[PDB]
Amino acid sequence: TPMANASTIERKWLVVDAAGKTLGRLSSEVAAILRGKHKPTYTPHVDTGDHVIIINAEKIELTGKKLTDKIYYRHTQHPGGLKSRTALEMRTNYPEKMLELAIKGMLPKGSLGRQMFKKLNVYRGSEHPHEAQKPEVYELRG
Amino acid sequence: SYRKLGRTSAQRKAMLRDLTTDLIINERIETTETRAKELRSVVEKMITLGKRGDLHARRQAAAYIRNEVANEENNQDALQKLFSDIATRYEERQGGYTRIMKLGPRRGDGAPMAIIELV
């Protein structure tokens, strides 16, 4: 009886700037955008969410002493395979997969989660190659 | 590297001597393909031994040719046949005295058979 969209979803493109916000508070909003929680036509099994582009990923910041205390782990399937780096080294070299690990942590787990991860595009600032899609600038709610 | 053909080395030597002599009398035999490939080099080596015609080459060939009758009502041995007919037939030709022509697989064991002939 209620509406449930399928193959009629219109997906927009959004640009999110990460110059002054946390890792962090923006990542939950980006995950909610990718899920489609901002649209009234949300249906939980058809991925009504839309594309988002994040620029200035190197300008991200995070409060406290997390630059030296937050540790990322990438354990292999080999014994003694625990490899670790700090948040400063992960931000300094390539913070793109920092942001994608944040979004992947806040996205749901499943086939739709891997599908909604594909709409995310994180780039080192401040230009993106998606000008042909004509993305609009999105301002964060807070 | 030579093949082992599933035999003991003494059995290998005996079977190769038997096949060499039987090819030398009957001039066309039908064996398996790998037996043909192992046999052809030995047969052309023995034909090369027959090319020389001297006593020492004949005594070398006598250690390999088995004592079976070659030509009936003539009392010709195979060792006489190498030095009378095959050597005079292949005097001009330099190697390649045998050819191998493959047949279909055998019924009882799926063995690929081959025709061996002196050419």
Binding site: T76, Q77, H78, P79 | -
Partner: protein, 207 residues
Amino acid sequence: TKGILGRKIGMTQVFAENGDLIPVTVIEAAPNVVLQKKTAENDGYEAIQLGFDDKREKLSNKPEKGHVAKAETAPKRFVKELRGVEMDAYEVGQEVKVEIFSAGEIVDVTGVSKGKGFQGAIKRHGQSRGPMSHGSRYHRRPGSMGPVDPNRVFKGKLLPGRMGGEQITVQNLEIVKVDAERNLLLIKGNVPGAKKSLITVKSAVKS
């Protein structure tokens, strides 16, 4: 850096300037023709392509014939890249020869090692052998797969398999003699691979 690639023939021994006897590996490695120059603005990195041992037109494809048309040369059997050479210093179609190496230099030798087939753990991994007597039924076997508690075998457990056919680099070999007339490099020591296989000789990482 500099380098050249070719075929090794076999090993011999050469005494030089004293009574001392040197094991020597002989490599045919000339001439090599520059086929393609990789640039950072187009390919993303700097490298050159070297072609060796040209062949008949029957064994070469039309893309292979068209790829070597720019260098003005016959199609070649072996193509490999060198990275990173001193850019540019070589133009497309210039012949690289054995005169670039003097007979006192230190070079890196790499190649595909000899194949051994599917071999047991004793030969493949150097594992020690079980007793042949005192009632023992154990020898030539890889060992216990590990503990009980993980309920699994850990990754990296050394087991029988195929040995050889992989790329092996031997570091810091010395050129004994260079032959510009017969296109030969004489290298001190042992070189991986079988006879008439492809051997790449590059300058060592100094120092």
